Structure formats: C-alpha cells, structure tokens
C-alpha cells in the first residue's frame, strides 16, 4: 500500500480540473514540478517545455511590475499572497490572471513546495468587482483543495 | 513519522509527472481489488477512447469491446490475466460514442522484488488507420511505465 498512494496521489492531482502548478523552491530558482492540464492548454505550452523552470514566463511587457514585487516578498519570506495580473499565453495572448500563491510546510515548518492557482476573467461595477473577489476566493479553496489531496 | 509520508507523497508528485510525459495510451490496474479496477488512465487513453477518468475509474477496461472484439482474443487476455504473465494481442474495441479501432494492447504484470504481481499495465495502440513494429513500442511504453512507478 506503499506505493499504491503514490498511485493514487497522481490521479488525485489529475482530476483537479483547474489551473495549477507545484513548485519546489529546495531546487535552483523554485522551478515547476508539476503542472495541470488545464494550466498547459490556458497558457498554450507543453511539460517539456515548461518543467524545471520558474513561472515568470507568463509575465510580459505590460505586466505590471509591481505587483510581481509582492510575490517575491511573499515567497522570499515564504507565506502566501494573492494578486492578479497580466499574463500572457505561449504565443502571446493577454488574459488577467487572478493568481493566488501559498506554501506547504512538513511537521519541521520547513516549506515542501508552493502550490499556485490561477484563475481567468477576461470598468469595474459592482458586480463585476464583486465577482473578481469571489473568484479570489475560488483560488484559495482550490489551492487549499490541492494542500488536502497531496498531505491525505 | 512525518518524513515517511513526505518522501511517499513527493514522489506521487514526480510519478504524476513522469507517467504522463510518457504521452502515450495506457492505465494501470489493481488485481487485488475486485474486477482488477482502473486505478490510473493516461490523458491520452481518454483522447483515444473518449471517455474521462470519472467514467473509467475502478471500472473494468472490457468496456472498451463491443459487437466484432474476437471472444478467443478476449479469452487470451484471461488466460494472460489468470496465470500472471504478458501478452501482446490485436483486438476491435469501441470509443464512448461507438467508433472501432484496432487495439494492438500489450498487457504486463508490474511485480515486486518477492516475483507475486502488484498491478497491471496495460498498453493501448490504434493500428487500424506496421504491424509487429508496434508490438514493440506497446512493450516500450510497458517498461516505461513499470519503472516509472517503481522508481523511488
Ligand atoms: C507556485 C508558484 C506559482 C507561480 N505562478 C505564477 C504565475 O502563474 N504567473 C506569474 O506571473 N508568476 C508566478 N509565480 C511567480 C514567479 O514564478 C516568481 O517565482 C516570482 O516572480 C519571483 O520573482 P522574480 O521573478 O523577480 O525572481 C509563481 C510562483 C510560485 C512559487
Ligand atoms: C491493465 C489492463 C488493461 C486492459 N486493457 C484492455 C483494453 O485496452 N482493451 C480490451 O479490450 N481489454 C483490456 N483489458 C482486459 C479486460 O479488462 C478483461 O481482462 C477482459 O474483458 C477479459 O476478462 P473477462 O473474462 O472478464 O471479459 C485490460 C486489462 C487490464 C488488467
Ligand atoms: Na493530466
């Protein structure tokens, strides 16, 4: 039963059907370990390309550098953050990312990985601003939804 | 303690990974459950025959036959299953909505170090659309997948 809940662990992860990466920031740069599918098909790359590098390639020229400020200072002191951003596909569509970051820690407090969700939603009204926070919400359950199925 | 499960679910992270860089059609089953049940199917098993892992998990793989699957080929597979040993046979199965291919499947047993038998691999391959050539890629894919998940 050893090595049945790694078995089990990967179709667990698979059938996560929202946009997602794990890192592992013990490895040079914190480079991505694992990507979902749907994450592959929203920004149109491949895991070879993709696997062992770090996820600044979604960034672009009008990303707005600032706000890439807070997810250094979040993982430099290694808790979680929310933002959303400007991110661009593999050929280089725009699409605002409503990310959310967060670490994974063993029983020693030392972070394992960062798990990272992403979210798309194309002024700002009531409604429309409204939902973006539900949506930043939505990021979090899954990212803690990830946090559960990988530790249980 | 702790680091028994770190290291147990880190590589169930890699194995995710690795198994689905495979790119190639194939699930993985559990002989000691009833029915030998899908526990794992690649993302191309599902582009190939059209169902997802919600519909194909802890069921059987027989429902991939249908009105012209040779029953004698499908007894080979018993034979195969029953006295734990490979085999590589050409078989008619059916997609979800109904489409014949022709599996050229390879089935392997994935044993531990003791010789009694884990899991099940099994290979898929559409031969219709070359004909020993592919009984040794189907084999390859096996080995692939064998070490993949044993790796550790
Ligand atoms: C798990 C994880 C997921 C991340 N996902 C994204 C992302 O989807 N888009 C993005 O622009 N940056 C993402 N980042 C941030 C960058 O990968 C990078 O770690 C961060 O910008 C550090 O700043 P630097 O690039 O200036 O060193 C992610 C980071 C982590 C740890
Ligand atoms: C890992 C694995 C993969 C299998 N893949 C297929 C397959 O792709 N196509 C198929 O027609 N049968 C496949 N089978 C065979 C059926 O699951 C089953 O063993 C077959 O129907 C014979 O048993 P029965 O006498 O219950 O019908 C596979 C079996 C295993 C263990
Ligand atoms: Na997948």
Redesign the pocket.
């Known amino acids: 039963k050893e090595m049945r809940k790694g078995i089990d662990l990967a179709t667990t992860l698979e059938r996560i059907e929202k946009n997602f990466?794990?890192?592992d920031?013990r490895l040079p740069?914190?480079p991505?370990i694992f990507a979902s599918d749907s994450?592959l098909e929203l920004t149109e790359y491949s895991r070879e390309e993709i696997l062992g590098r770090?996820?600044?390639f979604?960034?672009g020229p009008e990303?707005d550098l600032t706000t890439?400020?807070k997810?250094?200072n979040a993982?430099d002191n290694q808790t979680e953050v929310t933002v959303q951003?400007i991110?661009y596909t593999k050929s280089g569509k725009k699409f605002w990312?409503i990310?959310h970051?967060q670490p994974m820690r063993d029983q020693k407090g030392e972070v394992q990985?960062?798990?990272?969700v992403?979210l798309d939603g194309s002024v700002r009204n009531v409604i429309e601003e409204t939902a973006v926070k539900e949506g930043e919400d939505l990021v979090k359950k899954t990212a803690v939804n990830i946090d559960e199925a990988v530790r249980e």
């Open positions: 990466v794990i890192t920031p740069d914190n991505i994450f770090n996820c600044r979604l960034q990303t890439v400020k997810i250094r993982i951003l991110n990312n990310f970051l990985y960062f798990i990272g992403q």
